[PDB]
Ligand binder design. Sequence first.
Ligand SMILES: OC[C@H]1O[C@H](O[C@H]2[C@H](O)[C@@H](O)[C@@H](O)O[C@@H]2CO)[C@H](O)[C@@H](O)[C@@H]1O
Ligand SMILES: OC[C@H]1O[C@H](O[C@H]2[C@H](O)[C@@H](O)[C@@H](O)O[C@@H]2CO)[C@H](O)[C@@H](O)[C@@H]1O
Lengths: 437, 437
Amino acid sequence: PDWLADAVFYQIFPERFANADPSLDPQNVVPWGSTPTPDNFFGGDLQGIIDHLDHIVALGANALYLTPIFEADTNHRYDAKDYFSIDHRLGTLETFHALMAECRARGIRIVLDAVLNHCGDGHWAFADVVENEADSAYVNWFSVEGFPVTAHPTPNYRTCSGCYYLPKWNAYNPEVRHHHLDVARYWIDQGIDGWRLDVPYFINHTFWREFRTAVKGKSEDLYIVAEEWRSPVEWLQGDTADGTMNYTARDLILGFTADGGIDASALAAGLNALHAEIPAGFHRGMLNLLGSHDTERVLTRHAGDVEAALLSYALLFSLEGAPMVYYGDEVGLTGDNDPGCRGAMPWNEESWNTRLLDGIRTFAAFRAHQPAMRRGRQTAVALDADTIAIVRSGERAAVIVHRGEGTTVDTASIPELAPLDADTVVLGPLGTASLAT
Amino acid sequence: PDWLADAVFYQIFPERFANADPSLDPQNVVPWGSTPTPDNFFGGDLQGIIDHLDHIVALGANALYLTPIFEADTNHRYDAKDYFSIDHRLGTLETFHALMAECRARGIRIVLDAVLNHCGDGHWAFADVVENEADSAYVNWFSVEGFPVTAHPTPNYRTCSGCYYLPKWNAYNPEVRHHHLDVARYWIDQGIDGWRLDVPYFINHTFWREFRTAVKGKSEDLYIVAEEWRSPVEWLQGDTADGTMNYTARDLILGFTADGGIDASALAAGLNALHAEIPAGFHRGMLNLLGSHDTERVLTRHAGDVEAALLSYALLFSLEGAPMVYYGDEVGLTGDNDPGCRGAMPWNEESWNTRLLDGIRTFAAFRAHQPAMRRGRQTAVALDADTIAIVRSGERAAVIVHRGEGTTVDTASIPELAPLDADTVVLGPLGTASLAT
Ligand SMILES: OC[C@H]1O[C@H](O[C@H]2[C@H](O)[C@@H](O)[C@@H](O)O[C@@H]2CO)[C@H](O)[C@@H](O)[C@@H]1O
Ligand SMILES: OC[C@H]1O[C@H](O[C@H]2[C@H](O)[C@@H](O)[C@@H](O)O[C@@H]2CO)[C@H](O)[C@@H](O)[C@@H]1O
């Protein structure tokens, strides 16, 4: 769906964004500046989201990707216990409605996280099966080996990666399919713009063909994007998704800007190869990123070197497909991989790194003002071991990205750069240039 | 003299640059990392200068401006005691000769500091007058009121600003003139490229007419540059100097990049006015700078904000006239005004700020590769309260300098920028762009 050419995403983990309504907080909520764990709650909430929408817009984003928000027992909310309600700590459906209306009044589209492979050990249907066993009307909605159901010391029922508090949904049951496909419809009826697929590789392609057809039938332009850490090609045959989370680009970029493992020749060859692997009409549905809730933080991956991290963002905003910033990374937050990357969002602007923030907005502005940067063909061209041009044509546009101590670039002599004008371009240490027309 | 269009200066205070030969050190020399005072010696030396010439060249400089080096009792060497010899801690004339030969083999010209208004209280002629009084053959080479000569509690003889250890030279004596004009010849015979004038406003224009004629008669192309904290116009009538130390530009620039007192409109109006005050054929003899041995350090003036200081250097390297860097400032040294700015040069490269260094080299490279940046007419044009273009034409070239959080510049709509090509230019927070052809 074409609108993805002009999209810029901000991923939010709602428990850690903003505690607007401390009446919703649990009894043993912790302080906002606390160290995040797998078990503690900071009381982030949906009103916190409405109240800080202006920061999102100011950064340059016009789409949100939200991690789970339905009723659940954990702080991450991948153990859903009622798919038809907002978690009681997040807000009510009225709070949710109020968030949607403010979003549509700014041109901000919403994506929620579809967790259909599994649910929580506290869900009504799993908790009944535990209680009514083979007499339960929901016995077959899961894959339970025998009775009594036992989790410790090993679950006697199918689960997501062997985790006991996540029992596995039986998708071969038409009843389970019905419920599942009603989730996708119920939230589409509430003003949703699309769905991200939690671990879609743990189910089957026939299911996800069913899911596209129920989704695209509410509207063609609803967007489906698959979680996938490896090759995207399975998901882009035109029968499942519109794109994937582009972890392949993530590893190529950080390899070059942070690790030092890959030089620019290696970067471009991989980016062109990936472009050749991806099928026509699907390049611009790709969801591009440098980190998420399942990774260490960008600045931490960069060892605190802020200018180096700005090279990451420059390459991020140049690529064909839609770029996503993870909450806090724009303002300089640090942190190791989960739970460390699910720190609380600081709101006293004096603690922010505003130069990193303003760096990122500059790259957003250039892309937004340049059509070719949104709908151009992508060609990566290496200039140097330490210097690469990402060229976009619809009339070229091009971002050049230097990780060295300084350089000069001869436009007129690079055939894909030649159709631009200004002969030589000058790049400072860890420099970047953005050119057009 | 035309060669000044292509010059870039590095000012060195030799006592604090590099101690190559610790045999020359005084008995109560201090450690190299010591806090500088008005009284202590670090043992910097001329061999230290030869041994680190490559750093100078690497920075992008091709002229040196050296503060006093003749025999003296202080660490600054403004109390000269024998004008015809290198201070015994600095080296010998052989060491000095060896420095000159290495300089000519790299295309590095030398300027020494002419201190003709006064000498030291330990000079042979003043020390004789103290001893032989009215029978001294040198009585009239100074302005001594009576005998016995007394300094404390107030000197009974003329001095530089009332400082007792600096007795004042009698320049109305033709003998003193002879000696003085032999200094200027003796060091020109040793391969010198020019002279900086210590406090030339404390003597007279007739003297400095004599001094030009003895200097320019050895060679036209020898350069004379006057110390002057105020208006340069007195010194540029074509009978005294080729230019001044451009403290007027210094205060205009730092006002804008560090103080916040002056906006870009105010900056440009002052730079154009100054350009209109300066006489034709003298613009390119101006010696431009952001600090010296008589000021606090650039980075200290900037309160440790390195990117802001890089705005200073960008404007410095764009101006008509020859830019000078003060030793250590390129590598990030900090310090208050004298003695604080006469810190020792660190040589373990791990302590250097190499991003500031590499920032400055980038501006040097652009100027060196662009003829118009060396011989172009200068016009300052304000774009914004926070954004200015320095335009140079011989075919324009232009550096744009932003102190704000980010901006875009419409080339085609600014008549002095219009003759360049690339329509809009993009500037990040504290950004800079350098354009040409
Ligand atoms: O219980 C294992 C694991 O579950 C959750 O991980 C999610 C992940 O965040 C999703 O993006 C996707 O990859 O599926 C996973 C399984 O639902 C928690 O986020 C994580 O903390 C926890 O260890
Ligand atoms: O004794 C006063 C003063 O003398 C020296 O100052 C020099 C100055 O550095 C020159 O650049 C120029 O302005 O003339 C002055 C007088 O010769 C010392 O450098 C300074 O420390 C001292 O206080």
